[PDB]
Design a protein around this ligand. Structure first.
Ligand code: 0Q4
Lengths: 99, 99
């Protein structure tokens, strides 16, 4: 759909069979989800944001539904202030910025 | 225009008489520009994201041109790793997320 930006672009996602709310973040290269149990093997990764760097668990090829759209890709799990859907998955659902 | 998300959505902006590259960030409530000697008064603010918080100076009614589109609003100036155009200004240029 078309999402304006007067409110945070929050969407419902389904990951690991669990529903969550996440923010479509064009400023995120990656997808970072709050600490949770996720089925699959993972690798320790460090990612940076506005305030610094954090350690995350990198899960590859994770199936996730974002606003009713399917994406299968890298999901980082860690102490992020909010669940964020980055460009790696936004490109999968055909999301573009327009003005 | 339409901006795909294969790459970081960087656009040219003009603020305080300077041209800079900024990231269109739908996950940013506010706009934060790299440290620059902007005149006028401001008030201290702390903004956070992945990794923690950074202290910035908050300037109100700052005019910024984003990819040729004029906007006027609140701009935070501080030690940000990249110039970020948030929702407060993206709404002014009529930017939407589409998929
Ligand atoms: C081996 C490579 C591994 C990959 C790894 N990649 C990264 O770290 C890349 C660059 N990081 C990013 O792209 C990260 C997101 C995490 C991620 O994608 O991994 N992006 C980001 O963190 C971008 C800004 C940014 C972009 C690029 C570089 C640096 C910074 N911000 C994302 C973020 C989303 C938010 C909901 C948590 N928004 C914000 O941080 C903004 N914050 C907000 O909008 C609010 N929290 C308001 C602040 C609080 N207000 C207050 N106290 N009154 C801020 C910019 C004003 C590399 N570093 O190591």
């Amino acid at each position: 759909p078309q999402i304006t930006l007067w409110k945070r672009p929050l969407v419902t996602i389904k990951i690991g069979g669990q529903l969550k709310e996440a923010l479509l973040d064009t400023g995120a290269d990656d997808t970072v989800i709050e600490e949770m149990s996720l089925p699959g093997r993972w690798k320790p990764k460090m990612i940076g944001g506005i305030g610094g760097f954090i350690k995350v668990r990198q899960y590859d090829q994770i199936i996730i539904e974002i606003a009713g759209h399917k994406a299968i890709g890298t999901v980082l799990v860690g102490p992020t202030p909010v669940n964020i859907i980055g460009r790696d998955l936004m490109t999968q659902i055909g999301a573009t910025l327009n003005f």
